[PDB]
Structure formats: structure tokens, C-alpha cells
Amino acid sequence: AMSKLNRIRHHLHSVQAELAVFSDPVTVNYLTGFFCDPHERQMFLFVYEDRDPILFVPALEVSRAKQSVPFPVFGYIDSENPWQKIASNLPSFSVSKVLAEFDNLNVTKFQGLQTVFDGHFENLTPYIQNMR
Amino acid sequence: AMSKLNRIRHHLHSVQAELAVFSDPVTVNYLTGFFCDPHERQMFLFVYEDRDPILFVPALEVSRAKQSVPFPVFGYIDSENPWQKIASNLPSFSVSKVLAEFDNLNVTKFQGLQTVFDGHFENLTPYIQNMR
């Protein structure tokens, strides 16, 4: 799992992206061995250029996630604003370019991410797409 | 039968919207009785304020769609650019506000629609959301 995530981290530097945001349960599972379909709830795997990944899941999935991954995990309860929770817990170093899964993210979630990140979003690079 | 779609059309008059674009297979089925999940391929139901709806589907689904809905249907084969197909076939693009299903529509498809319509997109209104 860390092999794939390590490769992505190195790749981010090469394309001058600070961050890749994964939202597809299939992709997150491919990368981590942790499968969670949050349905209407929020889940993101934040893969940074400058640090280990951070996984954000619903509160009731936090402990399960922590057993699957070595890196930080945090969550939110349903009565909490998830975007506020993300903003409160992630680093605040400037992020100008973000990769995301445009074929998976709905516009609501995309606009939510855009309340946290002021950078420019684009779809995953072919390198990330074609990791197999 | 056309009851729901007629109501949506009249509702567009209440707001600054000239057009609603439906993409959720569940929503489209609720509105028309036609179910198709095109996944990566394109499915849109275009509901104008001033004319009958128009359904766009992959070419393989055109026959089935025409057996299901009484209003115009068109499609595209895999060698065709669906965005160009939409742009060359829809009767009107004089828009300022377009309603779309932000909870379903992915970013790829949203960006595709933005190449076709030069207007502000927003999520469905509560009235449309709460009909089902």
C-alpha cells in the first residue's frame, strides 16, 4: 500500500501539485487496502507531496480505518460540518494545484472541497490513473 | 405522465432558470419511466422552460428510449464527441441560469456541460429536490 502511495507522492512533485484527493472507494481501497463506501457521507484520502497521507472518514469508520493504515486518520460525526472538520485538521501550507478524481467526485463534494482548498483542481494524471 | 415534467417546466419560470439538466438515472426514471445508467458515457434529460423535454443517450439506447418517452430523443456513437453532438442538436443555448443535479453529476460531466452552456450552473431547487 505504501509502495503505491510513495510513488504518487514522488509523482506529485514532478507535476508541481501539492496534493491529490482520492474520493472513489475503489481507488482508496486499491491504494490502502481499506474499503469504505460512505454513500452520502464524506470520505477522502489526502495524499500530500510533503507528508504521509491523511485519511478522512465518517466517525463510525475511524477505528476500522486506523487498523488498515499506518498514517493519520480523522473523522466527523453527522452533526458536524465535514468541510469545517477537514479545514480544522489539515495543514494550512499553501496549496496551488490539487489533483482529484473528476470521474468520481460529484459537484456538491467538489464545491465542498473548494471551500477548504483555494487552489486549482484538475483530474488525476494518466500516471495515477494507470497504476496497475 | 408528463405531469412531473410539466411542473418542473413551470417551476423554471418562478426562478431565473431557462433550463434544468437531469443526469441521475434514478431521477430520470422517476420523471420518465426510462432507466439507464450510462456510467462513463453520457445520459442527460434537458428540460426547457418553453418546449418539450429532450433526452440524450448513448446511441445503443436510443431505440429503447424512444419506446419509453414521447418527446425528442437523440444519441451518439462512441466515435462521436458527445459535447459537440449536444451543441449541434439542442435548439437553444441562450441561457443565464441552468439547474443541474450537483449530488449526482460528476466533475468531468459538469465541465463537459460548461463547454455547451455559457451560463451559471446551480443545484436543483428545493421544489425539484423534494418532489420525489
UniProtKB/TrEMBL annotation, chains A, B:
Residue ranges occupied by any Creatinase N-terminal domain in the UniProt entry = 5-132
Coiled-coil residues = none
**Family from the record:** Belongs to the peptidase M24B family.
Q: Tell me the protein's name.
A: Proline dipeptidase
